Design a protein around this motif. Structure first.
Motif, PDB file in Angstrom:
ATOM      1  N   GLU A  56       3.885   4.748   2.747  1.00  0.00           N
ATOM      2  CA  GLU A  56       3.088   4.033   3.225  1.00  0.00           C
ATOM      3  C   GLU A  56       1.795   3.980   2.565  1.00  0.00           C
ATOM      4  O   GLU A  56       1.192   5.128   2.439  1.00  0.00           O
ATOM      5  N   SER A  96       5.569   0.961   0.610  1.00  0.00           N
ATOM      6  CA  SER A  96       6.320   0.438   1.622  1.00  0.00           C
ATOM      7  C   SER A  96       6.007  -0.964   1.664  1.00  0.00           C
ATOM      8  O   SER A  96       6.742  -2.012   2.178  1.00  0.00           O
ATOM      9  N   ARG A  97       4.912  -1.505   1.318  1.00  0.00           N
ATOM     10  CA  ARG A  97       4.109  -3.168   1.692  1.00  0.00           C
ATOM     11  C   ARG A  97       3.721  -3.500   0.200  1.00  0.00           C
ATOM     12  O   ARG A  97       3.011  -4.422   0.029  1.00  0.00           O
ATOM     13  N   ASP A  98       4.577  -2.836  -0.717  1.00  0.00           N
ATOM     14  CA  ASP A  98       4.454  -3.360  -2.035  1.00  0.00           C
ATOM     15  C   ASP A  98       3.336  -3.169  -3.093  1.00  0.00           C
ATOM     16  O   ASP A  98       3.388  -3.642  -4.064  1.00  0.00           O
TER      17      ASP A  98
END
Lengths: 186, 186
Positions: free
Chosen positions: B13, B45-47
């Protein structure tokens, strides 16, 4: 889906940058992290190095975007303020009545580019004097301020609130609430 | 100066990662962002793509560190849990009575590596069941939990509190207070 352009310059505040990118992606927004200076990795204020998704040169040809986001960081904001490409993107966003969101020192780029004059705005406390030079905005100490299509916020500690305000503006209150719960916010 | 090792795996994250790195550097801690899999950029996780400072292979030869930090992200934590290098680093940190700090899903790597059993811990709510398998820890819903040298926290929304707890543990209450004020925390 709604689309966001996040403009990433050397010296950007990495928390200011990553929290909105991540929260917007959690909301199903298509986020482009665009490097001001090109597609090479960007050294943020506290030395985190982020690889952009695209250069700004390329990303500006793929618009328009539902929101343009300006991270903070005093030296990142300076770079944003000095860019003709940023000036053109912001002017075009303002003219098409698209949202512009800026946090911390980021709103000072709005001043540099003559964007949204007459709006109520906030900034980081240490950026107030710069933002207010000439009296072109009305200042607020709220953690997030939104006056029509100009959305501003104060610092790393207000970045979740800022990001969720962007989510609410683009995708609505319910999506913002849904995204907020798993973040474990106080 | 105190030194921190932040172990960065694919699927970490990015908020969990960047907030502690940035806040620790604001505190004058020497932070090494070490890539679990090598020195190549890491897709969070969110690129968000973060370039590590070093490979874990190299950074583990430059210890010991005053704190080892394990970010969250369910798939990042899985990678941390599966790594023999992480097992060895954590065991050695525990044996030398060094701080270990983990957030969100990150504490589940403590379970995988049999670290700090009997401690009071928190995690992200969705990671509680995994953490508690076998009853080896006592669970807490506090936003930050510290039981001796095991420091844990819950999610992106508790990451400032987590990071400031690390700062307090390493550099004291006054430095934590000084670092906190410019963040504009609620």
């Amino acid at each position: 889906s709604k689309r966001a352009l996040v403009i990433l310059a050397k010296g950007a505040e990495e928390m200011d940058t990553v929290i909105p990118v991540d929260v917007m992606r959690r909301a199903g927004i298509k986020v482009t992290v665009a490097g001001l200076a090109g597609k090479d990795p960007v050294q943020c204020s506290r030395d985190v190095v982020i690889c952009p998704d695209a250069s700004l040169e390329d990303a500006k040809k793929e618009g328009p975007y539902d929101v343009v986001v300006l991270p903070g960081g005093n030296l990142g904001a300076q770079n944003l303020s000095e860019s003709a490409a940023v000036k053109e993107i912001l002017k075009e966003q303002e003219n098409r009545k698209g949202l512009i969101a800026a946090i911390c020192a980021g709103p000072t780029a709005l001043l540099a580019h003559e964007i949204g004059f007459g709006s109520k705005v906030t900034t980081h406390p240490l950026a107030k004097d710069k933002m207010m030079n000439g009296g072109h905005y009305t200042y607020s100490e709220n953690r997030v301020e939104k006056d029509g299509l100009i959305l501003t916020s104060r610092g790393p500690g207000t970045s979740f609130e800022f990001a969720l305000a962007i989510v609410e503006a683009l995708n609505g209150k319910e999506v913002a609430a849904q995204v907020k719960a798993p973040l474990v916010l106080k």
